[PDB]
Scaffold this active site. Structure first.
Site, PDB file in Angstrom:
ATOM      1  N   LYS A 191      14.492 -10.571   6.926  1.00  0.00           N
ATOM      2  CA  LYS A 191      15.111  -9.442   6.210  1.00  0.00           C
ATOM      3  C   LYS A 191      14.302  -8.153   6.326  1.00  0.00           C
ATOM      4  O   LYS A 191      13.103  -8.170   6.613  1.00  0.00           O
ATOM      5  CB  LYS A 191      15.368  -9.760   4.728  1.00  0.00           C
ATOM      6  CG  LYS A 191      16.490 -10.750   4.483  1.00  0.00           C
ATOM      7  CD  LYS A 191      16.620 -11.057   3.000  1.00  0.00           C
ATOM      8  CE  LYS A 191      17.858 -11.884   2.701  1.00  0.00           C
ATOM      9  NZ  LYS A 191      17.886 -12.321   1.277  1.00  0.00           N
ATOM     10  N   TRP A 249       5.261   2.292  -8.844  1.00  0.00           N
ATOM     11  CA  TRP A 249       6.354   1.358  -8.578  1.00  0.00           C
ATOM     12  C   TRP A 249       7.441   1.468  -9.649  1.00  0.00           C
ATOM     13  O   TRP A 249       8.621   1.630  -9.333  1.00  0.00           O
ATOM     14  CB  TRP A 249       5.837  -0.085  -8.495  1.00  0.00           C
ATOM     15  CG  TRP A 249       6.913  -1.071  -8.167  1.00  0.00           C
ATOM     16  CD1 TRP A 249       7.386  -1.386  -6.924  1.00  0.00           C
ATOM     17  CD2 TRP A 249       7.666  -1.862  -9.095  1.00  0.00           C
ATOM     18  NE1 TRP A 249       8.386  -2.324  -7.021  1.00  0.00           N
ATOM     19  CE2 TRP A 249       8.578  -2.634  -8.343  1.00  0.00           C
ATOM     20  CE3 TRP A 249       7.658  -1.991 -10.490  1.00  0.00           C
ATOM     21  CZ2 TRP A 249       9.474  -3.526  -8.940  1.00  0.00           C
ATOM     22  CZ3 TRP A 249       8.550  -2.879 -11.083  1.00  0.00           C
ATOM     23  CH2 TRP A 249       9.444  -3.632 -10.308  1.00  0.00           C
ATOM     24  N   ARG A 284       4.512   5.062   9.063  1.00  0.00           N
ATOM     25  CA  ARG A 284       4.934   4.400  10.293  1.00  0.00           C
ATOM     26  C   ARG A 284       6.391   3.961  10.186  1.00  0.00           C
ATOM     27  O   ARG A 284       6.916   3.767   9.090  1.00  0.00           O
ATOM     28  CB  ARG A 284       4.054   3.176  10.574  1.00  0.00           C
ATOM     29  CG  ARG A 284       2.577   3.496  10.765  1.00  0.00           C
ATOM     30  CD  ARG A 284       1.680   2.468  10.088  1.00  0.00           C
ATOM     31  NE  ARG A 284       1.454   1.277  10.898  1.00  0.00           N
ATOM     32  CZ  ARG A 284       1.054   0.093  10.424  1.00  0.00           C
ATOM     33  NH1 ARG A 284       0.844  -0.092   9.121  1.00  0.00           N
ATOM     34  NH2 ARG A 284       0.872  -0.922  11.262  1.00  0.00           N
ATOM     35  N   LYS A 337       0.844  -1.198   0.000  1.00  0.00           N
ATOM     36  CA  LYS A 337       0.000   0.000   0.000  1.00  0.00           C
ATOM     37  C   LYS A 337       0.880   1.250   0.000  1.00  0.00           C
ATOM     38  O   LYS A 337       0.539   2.264  -0.613  1.00  0.00           O
ATOM     39  CB  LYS A 337      -0.873  -0.005   1.253  1.00  0.00           C
ATOM     40  CG  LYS A 337      -1.829   1.168   1.392  1.00  0.00           C
ATOM     41  CD  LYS A 337      -2.381   1.269   2.808  1.00  0.00           C
ATOM     42  CE  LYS A 337      -3.181   0.039   3.215  1.00  0.00           C
ATOM     43  NZ  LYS A 337      -2.387  -0.933   4.021  1.00  0.00           N
ATOM     44  N   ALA A 364      -2.243  -3.141  13.508  1.00  0.00           N
ATOM     45  CA  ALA A 364      -3.543  -2.744  12.981  1.00  0.00           C
ATOM     46  C   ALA A 364      -4.652  -3.716  13.374  1.00  0.00           C
ATOM     47  O   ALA A 364      -5.751  -3.665  12.814  1.00  0.00           O
ATOM     48  CB  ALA A 364      -3.468  -2.618  11.468  1.00  0.00           C
ATOM     49  N   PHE A 420      -3.100  -2.819   6.912  1.00  0.00           N
ATOM     50  CA  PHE A 420      -4.058  -3.788   6.360  1.00  0.00           C
ATOM     51  C   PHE A 420      -5.108  -3.120   5.454  1.00  0.00           C
ATOM     52  O   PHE A 420      -4.873  -2.030   4.937  1.00  0.00           O
ATOM     53  CB  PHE A 420      -4.715  -4.618   7.479  1.00  0.00           C
ATOM     54  CG  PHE A 420      -3.745  -5.434   8.298  1.00  0.00           C
ATOM     55  CD1 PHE A 420      -2.690  -6.115   7.701  1.00  0.00           C
ATOM     56  CD2 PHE A 420      -3.925  -5.562   9.668  1.00  0.00           C
ATOM     57  CE1 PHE A 420      -1.817  -6.876   8.461  1.00  0.00           C
ATOM     58  CE2 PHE A 420      -3.054  -6.321  10.431  1.00  0.00           C
ATOM     59  CZ  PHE A 420      -2.001  -6.980   9.828  1.00  0.00           C
ATOM     60  N   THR A 465       3.733   2.077  -1.387  1.00  0.00           N
ATOM     61  CA  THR A 465       4.185   2.568  -2.693  1.00  0.00           C
ATOM     62  C   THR A 465       3.255   3.650  -3.238  1.00  0.00           C
ATOM     63  O   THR A 465       3.717   4.664  -3.761  1.00  0.00           O
ATOM     64  CB  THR A 465       4.302   1.431  -3.731  1.00  0.00           C
ATOM     65  OG1 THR A 465       3.293   0.447  -3.486  1.00  0.00           O
ATOM     66  CG2 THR A 465       5.655   0.767  -3.647  1.00  0.00           C
ATOM     67  N   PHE A 479       0.119  -3.902 -13.651  1.00  0.00           N
ATOM     68  CA  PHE A 479       0.890  -5.135 -13.695  1.00  0.00           C
ATOM     69  C   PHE A 479       0.872  -5.612 -15.145  1.00  0.00           C
ATOM     70  O   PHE A 479      -0.185  -5.584 -15.779  1.00  0.00           O
ATOM     71  CB  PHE A 479       0.257  -6.169 -12.766  1.00  0.00           C
ATOM     72  CG  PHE A 479       1.169  -7.306 -12.399  1.00  0.00           C
ATOM     73  CD1 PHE A 479       2.048  -7.193 -11.331  1.00  0.00           C
ATOM     74  CD2 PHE A 479       1.138  -8.495 -13.115  1.00  0.00           C
ATOM     75  CE1 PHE A 479       2.886  -8.244 -10.988  1.00  0.00           C
ATOM     76  CE2 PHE A 479       1.974  -9.549 -12.780  1.00  0.00           C
ATOM     77  CZ  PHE A 479       2.849  -9.424 -11.714  1.00  0.00           C
TER      78      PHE A 479
END
Ligand SMILES: [K+]
Ligand SMILES: [K+]
Ligand SMILES: [K+]
Ligand SMILES: [K+]
Lengths: 556, 556
Positions: free
Chosen positions: B104, B409, B93, B70, B272, B300, B72, B381
């Site tokens: 990672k 993106w 956040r 979200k 959340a 979320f 991005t 996409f």
């Protein structure tokens, strides 16, 4: 009048201007506000041929209730040296966060010999102790996870020596059982928390020469033992890379300043009993390149902190001390003679005569055993009379040493001019034949015996059967040639805190011996050790407060 | 090019120059190196009567195994608005430290819509989480000390609800017994750790209007109960001032930037589910005064993060959203229609229409229930067909909402220009009738019912006997008029994670109800909660490394 009043009322320089005094470019520093900066450790590689500054170790006699604190002298001597036109700086330890909420917290030094900003240094500062704690706790998590996920290394969970940590005074975490709540939630075991400064990560942090050496020491850490009693290291767990990563920024020394603008590194803060009691090697070595004089210090009296500075740090850092300042007071020496806390304001040559041998033993150790130019710094107190002050000077002169009065607390750098003058004199004129009191290739037991006899003045050491067994096992594992860190009381040269002055006809009792493989020294234990202090009935936290601006009140 | 490579190669501005874009001079910002800065929260009080910026809430459809934004979109939309000559900034956040050593680190966003520096943000950053943890663990230590020193408050140690914390994925600390080793070392009790971001301190920190409100929320925290069942607060332990002091600098929002230099606040990071999943109120409100447009987000899907942003955060902050962006993908919609994880690349309009109702419910919620101007963002996409995009656009337009293609993106700010235009348009032209879906006057059970009925599309709520008793107890303690925070699965509109699309004829099972008095909301529990995640078989920590120069590798 008070420390906080003096601190918050002082006109302070921008840290860039402080950094200029030691030849640091603005590309070499990273600002944390206007009055704090981190200095990149990689620049030390560029000063490989510059040759070290004059190194001045501030130590003291065995601590007493009378005073004292040697940090006022450390700061003052640094201030006085710059007032005599010398390019000097200081290297101190950073204080732990926990005790501030128990017993208030205080100044790095005091009076007109402080380091600032005091409020920041006594809280998070630049975040080093958090980073040190995170490394410690990552390793703890990874130990248990490895066991949880199959235990290919065959770690006996009951034989994990690595402990978790937190920078709070929390007695509730001294002894715990964790990994409970069924097989989904761990493997049950007995565990405990040290306060962050007691973690072996801290000693490794403070003894690392560079980022490479840091990672090597981390990998070397022994976290516990297998079911058949074989050491298991952090390297076997592949933890060293991640721990070093967490310590990447923290390992950069912190630049602050004294009230009179003298450059000061505040970096690291291990104990002086189960560790060596000095600030980071990285900070000391970097200060030795960026200035002409450096004044640093070691915790507690010269029997502990100085002994460990000289026999552990100097040899690991490959540095050589040019001068030692043994701090002391008339009151403290009368206490060593038998005078009660309440009665110290009265004159007493007979008690001063009886308790003076404590100072003389220390003065003797630095000059005669280590072979380093020494001066004694007498912090002035109203009570003191000329006769008292004269006898000290007289007895110090018999050992070929001057006892100079100091008023750094009340008069700042001016109060240290005469001390500073004498320090420069003994550097130029005084004979220096420095070497550690034992060789690395000596046996562990013999090393402990050497320090006990030569430094404390003991007839010998009484090793317990468990201690003897542990030493043999450690030498069998290949740790015979590492230095020794004796954990004992600070209040006496002996391992009994009651025996003041210059006790004789005594021996030290070593109950156990434990390796700190990362740190690279063996800890010899005498009595009980506190690694997690608790809070009192009325914690200072209750009177700490903030509101408009913030403006944190009640810290001091 | 990977996220880390893009961030590492990008040419980035000095934070001074980022700060000037929102009217901040060097005296307003506090540097953490060249690229990070803290801004004093007290700055907000002199913009008292300035009108708030345009508030844009980025949200999403229910998360899937596929992806969807979200962040991005949040970052790219900010970039896009600035490209349109608008004074825009973002609020995000901060991520937890622990998970980085397990699976990672991750980019704040992705591709060409990132916030930087990425490394710092995924490690210690500005030290906020360490401060939040310190506050939590100070309170713990003070609870146990109080009991230890006499227990005048009469706390039943078995009824202490306050938990310790650490920002590491350590399952070994989920269930412990501490206070062992006899009467010198504590009082034995069952205890446990949460990961730091799950601490109630995180929710309080994120919901506080100012320092005064922070201190009041902290003192209000219920830490447990007496032997006769009465709540005991941190105020009664006199810890709020000390906790506020630990949070002083932390509470100052952190200023960083996007790859295109768009100003960005990164501050706070609660969950959340058991919390509200938004960045701090102090960062948002402060962003609303310094800019003309503020883009922020909640965790979320819109059934969780957005619901809690609107029904909890907005009322507490006294802010009104001007626009809402619902992020979605064709593949995620097709997954909701029953298509497997592997077969999403093939075109399938039958499944797309079958899973489209998930998006339609969220669009319906924001436009009809909340009454906020909405735009749907379709993250482009390659495998998406023109016919699929056309179907989504047709259905969205059927509810008076446009579905705009987003390429943030791949293309960065350029890829979000069309979204920003539509966002600016619906702000100026769209009818805004914003109001929370429940008034605070309503009872706790009805408040829970309203959310399930209106937002989830539930038939109602089945409260378990324990939940009914807990609700009544809380209302008697004076917590009837507080907001409700439902903890449920994110993957479904229902509490059953298997039920995709837009399920009908279902009920939500509430097993328990717990108060977070400091946060000022009630937590409604459906299923099992994980407040402390574990490490995997092969932790990411194993490949994290540092070289001789201190360069970190393997973090991403
Ligand atoms: K500190
Ligand atoms: K153990
Ligand atoms: K972080
Ligand atoms: K409990």
């Amino acid at each position: 009048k008070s420390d906080i009043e003096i601190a918050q009322e002082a006109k302070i320089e921008h840290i860039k201007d402080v950094a200029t005094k030691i030849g640091l470019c603005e590309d070499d520093i990273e600002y944390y506000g206007k009055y704090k900066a981190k200095i990149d450790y990689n620049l030390l590689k560029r000063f490989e041929d510059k040759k070290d500054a004059k190194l001045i170790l501030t130590t003291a006699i065995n601590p007493t209730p009378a005073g004292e604190g040697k940090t006022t002298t450390t700061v003052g001597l640094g201030d006085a040296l710059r007032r005599l036109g010398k390019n000097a700086m200081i290297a101190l330890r950073e204080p732990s966060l926990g005790p501030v909420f128990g017993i208030k917290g205080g100044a790095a030094g005091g009076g007109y010999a402080q380091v600032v900003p005091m409020e920041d240094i006594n809280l998070h500062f630049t975040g080093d102790f958090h980073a040190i704690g995170a490394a410690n706790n990552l390793l703890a998590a990874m130990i248990d996870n490895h066991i949880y996920q199959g235990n290919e290394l065959n770690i006996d969970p009951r034989r994990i020596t690595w402990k978790r940590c937190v920078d709070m005074n929390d007695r509730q975490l001294r002894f715990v059982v964790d990994g409970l709540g069924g097989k989904a939630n761990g493997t049950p075991r007995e565990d405990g928390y040290d306060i962050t400064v007691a973690s072996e990560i801290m000693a490794v942090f403070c003894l690392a020469n560079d980022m490479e050496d840091l990672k090597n020491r981390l990998a070397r850490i022994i976290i516990g033992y297998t079911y058949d009693g074989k050491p298991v290291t952090a390297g076997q767990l592949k933890a060293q890379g991640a721990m070093a990563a967490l310590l990447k920024d923290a390992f950069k020394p912190n630049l602050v300043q004294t009230l009179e603008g003298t450059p000061a590194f505040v970096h690291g803060g291990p104990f002086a009993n189960i560790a060596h009691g000095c600030n980071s090697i990285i900070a000391t070595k970097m200060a030795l390149k960026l200035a002409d004089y450096v004044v640093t210090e070691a915790g507690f009296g010269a029997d502990l902190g100085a002994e460990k500075f000289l026999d552990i740090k100097c040899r690991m850092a490959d540095i050589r001390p040019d001068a030692v300042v043994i701090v002391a007071t008339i009151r403290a020496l009368k206490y060593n003679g038998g005078v009660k806390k309440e009665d110290l304001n009265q004159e007493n040559l007979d008690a001063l005569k009886k308790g003076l041998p404590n100072l003389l033993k220390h003065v003797e150790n630095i000059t005669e055993k280590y072979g380093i130019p020494t001066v004694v710094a007498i912090n002035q107190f109203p009570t003191d009379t000329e006769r008292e002050l004269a006898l000290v000077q007289e007895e110090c002169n018999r050992l070929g040493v001057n006892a100079v009065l100091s008023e750094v607390w009340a008069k700042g750098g001016e109060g240290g001019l005469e001390l500073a003058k004498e320090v420069v004199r003994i550097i130029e004129e005084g004979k220096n034949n420095f070497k550690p009191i034992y060789d690395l290739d000596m046996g562990i037991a013999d090393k402990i015996t050497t320090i006990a006899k030569e430094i404390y003045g003991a007839d010998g050491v009484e090793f317990a059967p468990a201690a003897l067994k542990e030493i043999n096992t450690l030498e069998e594992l290949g740790f015979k040639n590492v230095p020794v860190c004796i954990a004992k009381t600070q209040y006496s040269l002996t391992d009994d805190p009651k025996l003041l002055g210059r006790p004789t006809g005594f021996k030290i009792n070593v109950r156990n011996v434990k390796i700190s493989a990362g740190a690279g020294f063996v800890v010899a234990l005498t009595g009980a050790i506190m690694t997690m202090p608790g809070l009192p009935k009325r914690p200072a936290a209750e009177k700490i407060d903030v509101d408009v601006n913030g403006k944190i009140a009640g810290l001091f």
